[PDB]
Scaffold this active site. Structure first.
Site, PDB file in Angstrom:
ATOM      1  N   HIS A  41       0.807  -1.220   0.000  1.00 49.53           N
ATOM      2  CA  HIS A  41       0.000   0.000   0.000  1.00 49.53           C
ATOM      3  C   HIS A  41       0.835   1.262   0.000  1.00 49.53           C
ATOM      4  CE1 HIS A  41       0.362  -0.165   4.516  1.00 49.53           C
ATOM      5  NE2 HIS A  41       0.408   1.143   4.355  1.00 49.53           N
ATOM      6  N   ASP A  88       0.002  -7.715   1.837  1.00 51.32           N
ATOM      7  CA  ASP A  88       0.475  -6.346   1.783  1.00 51.32           C
ATOM      8  C   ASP A  88       1.992  -6.313   1.768  1.00 51.32           C
ATOM      9  OD1 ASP A  88       0.575  -3.626   1.946  1.00 51.32           O
ATOM     10  OD2 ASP A  88      -0.583  -3.477   3.808  1.00 51.32           O
ATOM     11  N   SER A 173       4.371   2.310   8.076  1.00 50.19           N
ATOM     12  CA  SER A 173       3.986   1.282   7.122  1.00 50.19           C
ATOM     13  C   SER A 173       5.195   0.944   6.289  1.00 50.19           C
ATOM     14  CB  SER A 173       2.890   1.795   6.217  1.00 50.19           C
ATOM     15  OG  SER A 173       1.773   2.226   7.037  1.00 50.19           O
TER      16      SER A 173
HETATM   17  C1  LIG Z   1       1.358   3.614   7.375  1.00 52.66           C
HETATM   18  O1  LIG Z   1       2.416   3.833   7.953  1.00 52.66           O
HETATM   19  C2  LIG Z   1       0.109   3.320   8.205  1.00 52.66           C
HETATM   20  N1  LIG Z   1      -0.843   2.357   7.708  1.00 52.66           N
HETATM   21  C3  LIG Z   1      -2.062   2.720   7.299  1.00 52.66           C
HETATM   22  O2  LIG Z   1      -2.558   3.842   7.301  1.00 52.66           O
HETATM   23  C4  LIG Z   1      -2.837   1.527   6.776  1.00 52.66           C
HETATM   24  C5  LIG Z   1      -2.822   1.487   5.260  1.00 52.66           C
HETATM   25  C6  LIG Z   1      -4.206   1.586   4.725  1.00 52.66           C
HETATM   26  C7  LIG Z   1      -5.121   1.797   5.926  1.00 52.66           C
HETATM   27  N2  LIG Z   1      -4.241   1.675   7.089  1.00 52.66           N
HETATM   28  C8  LIG Z   1      -4.595   1.629   8.369  1.00 52.66           C
HETATM   29  O3  LIG Z   1      -3.780   1.513   9.277  1.00 52.66           O
HETATM   30  C9  LIG Z   1      -6.089   1.636   8.669  1.00 52.66           C
HETATM   31  N3  LIG Z   1      -6.375   0.362   9.318  1.00 52.66           N
HETATM   32  C10 LIG Z   1      -7.370  -0.314   8.675  1.00 52.66           C
HETATM   33  O4  LIG Z   1      -7.693  -0.050   7.512  1.00 52.66           O
HETATM   34  C11 LIG Z   1      -8.062  -1.363   9.453  1.00 52.66           C
HETATM   35  C12 LIG Z   1      -8.469  -1.192  10.800  1.00 52.66           C
HETATM   36  C13 LIG Z   1      -9.269  -2.161  11.430  1.00 52.66           C
HETATM   37  C14 LIG Z   1      -9.561  -3.371  10.776  1.00 52.66           C
HETATM   38  C15 LIG Z   1     -10.293  -4.469  11.485  1.00 52.66           C
HETATM   39  O5  LIG Z   1     -11.225  -4.289  12.262  1.00 52.66           O
HETATM   40  N4  LIG Z   1      -9.898  -5.739  11.309  1.00 52.66           N
HETATM   41  C16 LIG Z   1     -10.724  -6.788  11.887  1.00 52.66           C
HETATM   42  C17 LIG Z   1     -10.483  -8.096  11.187  1.00 52.66           C
HETATM   43  O6  LIG Z   1      -9.086  -8.227  11.197  1.00 52.66           O
HETATM   44  C18 LIG Z   1      -8.544  -7.416  10.206  1.00 52.66           C
HETATM   45  C19 LIG Z   1      -8.541  -6.098  10.912  1.00 52.66           C
HETATM   46  C20 LIG Z   1      -9.105  -3.530   9.450  1.00 52.66           C
HETATM   47  C21 LIG Z   1      -8.357  -2.555   8.791  1.00 52.66           C
HETATM   48  C22 LIG Z   1      -6.478   2.820   9.597  1.00 52.66           C
HETATM   49  C23 LIG Z   1      -5.797   4.125   9.156  1.00 52.66           C
HETATM   50  C24 LIG Z   1      -7.971   3.005   9.576  1.00 52.66           C
HETATM   51  C25 LIG Z   1       0.540   2.953   9.659  1.00 52.66           C
HETATM   52  C26 LIG Z   1       1.103   1.560   9.731  1.00 52.66           C
HETATM   53  C27 LIG Z   1      -0.640   3.087  10.610  1.00 52.66           C
HETATM   54  C28 LIG Z   1       1.051   4.038   5.816  1.00 52.66           C
HETATM   55  F1  LIG Z   1      -0.221   3.599   5.546  1.00 52.66           F
HETATM   56  F2  LIG Z   1       1.947   3.733   4.733  1.00 52.66           F
HETATM   57  C29 LIG Z   1       1.061   5.491   5.754  1.00 52.66           C
HETATM   58  F3  LIG Z   1       2.229   5.922   6.201  1.00 52.66           F
HETATM   59  F4  LIG Z   1       0.901   5.784   4.486  1.00 52.66           F
HETATM   60  F5  LIG Z   1       0.079   5.872   6.524  1.00 52.66           F
END
Ligand SMILES: *[C@](=O)([C]([N]C(=O)[C]1[C][C][C]N1C(=O)[C]([N]C(=O)C1=[C][C]=C(C(=O)N2[C][C]O[C][C]2)[C]=[C]1)[C]([C])[C])[C]([C])[C])C(F)(F)C(F)(F)F
Ligand SMILES: *[C@@H]1O[C@H](CO[C@@H]2O[C@@H](C)[C@@H](O)[C@@H](O)[C@@H]2O)[C@@H](O[C@@H]2O[C@H](CO)[C@@H](O)[C@H](O)[C@H]2NC(C)=O)[C@H](O)[C@H]1NC(C)=O
Ligand SMILES: *[C@@H]1O[C@H](CO[C@@H]2O[C@@H](C)[C@@H](O)[C@@H](O)[C@@H]2O)[C@@H](O[C@@H]2O[C@H](CO)[C@@H](O)[C@H](O)[C@H]2NC(C)=O)[C@H](O)[C@H]1NC(C)=O
Length: 218
Positions: A41, A88, A173
């Site tokens: 992603h 991912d 991420s």
């Molecule tokens: C990065 O550093 C960050 N990652 C993110 O922003 C990721 C990428 C796309 C969305 N995202 C999230 O962290 C999102 N989390 C979810 O989409 C999510 C939350 C909860 C559930 C859930 O309930 N599940 C239940 C069943 O099990 C599966 C999980 C699913 C998915 C959040 C923002 C809403 C950090 C690591 C946080 C990056 F993305 F590259 C960034 F730097 F670009 F942000």
């Protein structure tokens, strides 16, 4: 990283900072002199021709001569599910090869299918948000986290910093999860917001992809 500490300068030589127009946007791990591993992603909706792969960094705000900068040359993905956040992982081949040294070292991966157990001690790192709201780190942070299996898909390797409000946040991420000196996770997504204190952060399970990674990096 929320709730961690500054990593000693060049403590983790495989740590990589992916950047777009001077600004870090994702973490990555060096896995071959010319191959970096990150989260699918991260390169998803981004102009890959402009992404620069910075190796040998520690403090992103200063000009460091330790740094080696490469560009992406080839993208390899294996069933990345954008909606359910599965598989991912992305292998990015560099346009050249890192000169291996004290600052730039290659990471090691677990064996294909090496499942981590609940309670295993691991260390997470990255230059992401310092706090749920607090700005992006400038100096690489690290954080002691524990593998958990509750509230977590088998298709992920989850961690929890038991009894505290700490964990990975936005910008981490792609960052690695080193357990027993092996990269067992690729920072992917958080739940309940960064550092909820209730939900585990999820990493892409490198172990389940070791075969694929190898056929590529040869
Ligand atoms: C990065 O550093 C960050 N990652 C993110 O922003 C990721 C990428 C796309 C969305 N995202 C999230 O962290 C999102 N989390 C979810 O989409 C999510 C939350 C909860 C559930 C859930 O309930 N599940 C239940 C069943 O099990 C599966 C999980 C699913 C998915 C959040 C923002 C809403 C950090 C690591 C946080 C990056 F993305 F590259 C960034 F730097 F670009 F942000
Ligand atoms: C591999 O790529 C690097 C980085 O290329 C730069 O960043 C890309 C995202 C893209 O915008 C390119 O046009 C940029 O040049 C190369 O390193 C640069 O090389 C040029 C020419 O030698 C030099 O002027 C820059 O200062 C170099 N360093 C940086 C940080 O840009 C590198 O030469 C490429 N090839 C090899 C074999 O490594
Ligand atoms: C916090 O983590 C550090 C580092 O974790 C270890 O190294 C990582 C790369 C990874 O392999 C983890 O699974 C490891 O647990 C711990 O530091 C180690 O401490 C022991 C003694 O306690 C020492 O023998 C090692 O040399 C240290 N490792 C390093 C790399 O310095 C530290 O113990 C953890 N702290 C807590 C409270 O658990």
């Amino acid at each position: 990283i929320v709730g961690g500490r500054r990593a000693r300068p060049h403590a983790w030589p495989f740590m990589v900072s992916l950047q777009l127009a001077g600004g870090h946007f994702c973490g990555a791990t060096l896995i071959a002199p010319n191959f970096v591993m990150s989260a699918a992603h991260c390169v998803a909706n981004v102009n890959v021709r402009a992404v620069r792969v910075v190796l040998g960094a520690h403090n992103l705000s200063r000009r460091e001569p330790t740094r080696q900068v490469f560009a992406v040359q080839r993208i390899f993905e294996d069933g990345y599910d954008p909606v359910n956040l599965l598989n991912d992982i992305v292998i990015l081949q560099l346009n050249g090869s890192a000169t291996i040294n004290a600052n730039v070292q290659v990471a090691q991966l677990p064996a294909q299918g090496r499942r981590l157990g609940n309670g295993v001690q691991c260390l997470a790192m990255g230059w992401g948000l310092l706090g749920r709201n607090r700005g992006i780190a400038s100096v690489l942070q690290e954080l002691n986290v524990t593998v958990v299996t509750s509230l977590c898909r088998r298709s992920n390797v989850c961690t929890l910093v038991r009894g505290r409000q700490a964990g990975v946040c936005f910008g981490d991420s792609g960052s690695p999860l080193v357990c027993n000196g092996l990269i067992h996770g690729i920072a992917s997504f958080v739940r309940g917001g960064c550092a909820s204190g209730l939900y585990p952060d999820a990493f892409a399970p490198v172990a389940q992809f070791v075969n694929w990674i190898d056929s590529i990096i040869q």
